[PDB]
A paper describes a structure:
The pathogenicity of Shigella sp. is dependent on a complex macromolecular machine, the type 3 secretion system (T3SS), that delivers into host cells a set of effector proteins required for invasion. Across bacterial species, this protein (known as MxiC in Shigella sp.) possesses only weak sequence homology and in some species exists as two separate polypeptide chains (e.g., in Yersinia sp. the homologue consists of YopN and TyeA). MxiC is an elongated rod-shaped molecule with a long axis of 86 Å.
In order to improve the quality of MxiC crystals, a shortened construct encompassing residues 74–355 (MxiCNΔ73) was expressed, purified and subjected to crystallization trials. The first and last domains consist only of the X-bundle motif while the central domain also possesses a bent helix (α5) that is packed against domain 1. It is the first two domains of MxiC that are equivalent to YopN while the third domain of MxiC, equivalent to TyeA, is connected to domain 2 via a ten-residue linker. These structures reveal that, although the fold of each domain is maintained in all structures (rmsd over Cα atoms of domains 1, 2 and 3 are 0.5 Å, 0.9 Å and 0.8 Å, respectively), there is some flexibility at the interfaces between domains resulting in a “wobble” of the terminal domains about the central domain (rmsd over all Cα atoms of 1.4 Å). Interestingly, mapping of sequence conservation onto the structure across the more closely related Salmonella, Burkholderia and Shigella species reveals a hydrophobic patch on the surface of the central domain consisting of residues Leu222, Met226, Gly239, Leu242 and Leu245 (red circle). Surprisingly, the most striking difference instead involves the long á-helix (α9) in the central domain of MxiC, which is straight in all of our MxiC structures, but possesses a sharp kink in YopN when complexed with TyeA. It is the straightening of this helix that results in a reorientation of the C-terminal domain of MxiC, compared with TyeA, and opens one face of the molecule.
Numbering used by the authors: 64 to 355
The structure:
C-alpha cells in the first residue's frame, strides 16, 4: 500500500440520491428502525432499498448506521451481513460508485449535471464492453458537445481516486485495462481537437450550415468504417458545395487523419485505407476543379 492509513469515515456524504436534508431524514428513519431500541432486520431491507434504489447508496447508508456508538452487539453482525449481500457479485459497481462520488459531485456542480448521472458514467466506463469510438459517441450523445472533453477529465480523476481508495473497484491488472482504455479515449480527444482546428482554418463552420457535432461524428465513423469514407462524407458535400469547393472539405479530413494518433484505427492497414480513399477524393476534386 503501504503507509497511507486508508481511511475512511464519511459515507453519508457519498450518497447521491436526493438532497442533504432528504437523505438525512432517510438515514435517521433507519437509525430509528432501529439500532437504538433493538428490532428486527427483515423487510427493513425493503425499506432501505425503497429509500435508496442504488446499491452504492444502500451500502453507504448501512456504513453510517454502523457508526452508531452502542455498540452492541449481534446488531453489528446483521448490519455487516446485509452489506455483504448487496455488495456480493457487484463489488466493482458498488466500489466504483462509492469511490467516485465526490468527483461526481465536484464535476456535477461544474458541468451543471446531476451527480448520479456521472456515477453511472464512471461505472459504465469501467464495466462496459464497447469500443473506444462507441464510448466517445455515447458520451457525446448523452452529455453534449460542450461536455465531451470535460467528461473524460471526470473519468480520469475518478480513476485516480479509485486507484487510491482503500477499496478499489478493480485489481492492478484490471485498472491496467482501464488505463489503456482511457489513453485510447484521450487519443480520440486529441484528434477531436486536431479536427476542430482544421475546420477553423477551412471556416467550414463559420456560417452555421454545418454542425461541429455532426462533422465530428463523421470523423468518428471514418475511424470505424474507413472503406466507407466517401459515403460518410456525402451529406457534408451536399451542404458544403454552396460555399466550398469539394477538395477543401476532403483536405480537412485527410490532414486531420494524417496528423492524428495512429492507434485510433483498428490497425495501420485500416488507417492506410482511410488515407488512400481521402487522397483519391482530394486528387479527383482538384483535377475536376482546375480542368475545368
Amino acid at each position: 500500500s503501504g503507509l497511507v492509513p486508508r481511511g475512511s469515515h464519511m459515507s453519508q456524504e457519498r450518497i447521491l440520491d436526493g438532497e442533504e436534508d432528504e437523505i438525512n431524514h432517510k438515514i435517521f428513519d433507519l437509525k430509528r428502525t432501529l439500532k437504538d431500541n433493538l428490532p428486527l432486520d427483515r423487510d427493513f431491507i425493503d425499506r432501505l432499498k425503497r429509500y435508496f434504489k442504488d446499491p452504492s447508496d444502500q451500502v453507504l447508508a448501512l456504513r453510517e448506521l454502523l457508526n452508531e456508538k452502542d455498540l452492541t452487539a449481534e446488531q453489528v453482525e446483521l448490519l455487516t451481513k446485509i452489506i455483504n449481500e448487496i455488495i456480493s457479485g457487484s463489488e466493482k459497481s458498488v466500489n466504483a460508485g462509492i469511490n467516485s462520488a465526490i468527483q461526481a459531485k465536484l464535476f456535477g456542480n461544474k458541468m451543471k449535471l446531476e451527480p448520479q448521472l456521472l456515477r453511472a458514467c464512471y461505472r459504465g466506463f469501467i464495466m462496459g464492453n464497447i469500443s473506444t469510438t462507441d464510448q466517445y459517441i455515447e458520451w457525446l450523445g448523452n452529455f453534449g458537445f460542450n461536455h465531451r472533453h470535460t467528461i473524460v477529465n471526470f473519468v480520469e480523476q475518478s480513476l485516480i481516486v479509485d486507484m487510491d481508495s482503500e477499496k478499489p473497484s478493480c485489481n492492478a491488472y484490471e485498472f491496467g485495462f482501464v488505463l489503456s482504455k482511457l489513453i485510447a479515449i484521450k487519443m480520440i480527444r486529441t484528434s477531436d481537437v486536431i479536427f476542430m482546428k482544421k475546420l477553423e482554418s477551412s471556416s467550414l463552420l463559420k456560417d452555421g450550415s454545418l454542425s461541429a457535432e455532426q462533422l465530428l461524428l463523421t470523423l468518428l465513423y471514418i475511424f470505424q468504417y474507413p472503406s466507407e469514407s466517401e459515403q460518410i462524407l456525402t451529406s457534408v458535400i451536399e451542404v458544403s458545395r454552396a460555399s466550398h469547393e469539394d477538395s477543401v472539405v476532403y483536405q480537412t479530413y485527410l490532414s486531420s487523419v494524417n496528423e492524428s494518433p495512429h492507434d485510433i484505427f483498428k490497425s495501420e492497414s485500416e488507417r492506410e485505407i482511410a488515407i488512400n480513399i481521402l487522397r483519391e477524393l482530394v486528387t479527383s476534386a482538384y483535377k475536376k476543379e482546375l480542368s475545368r
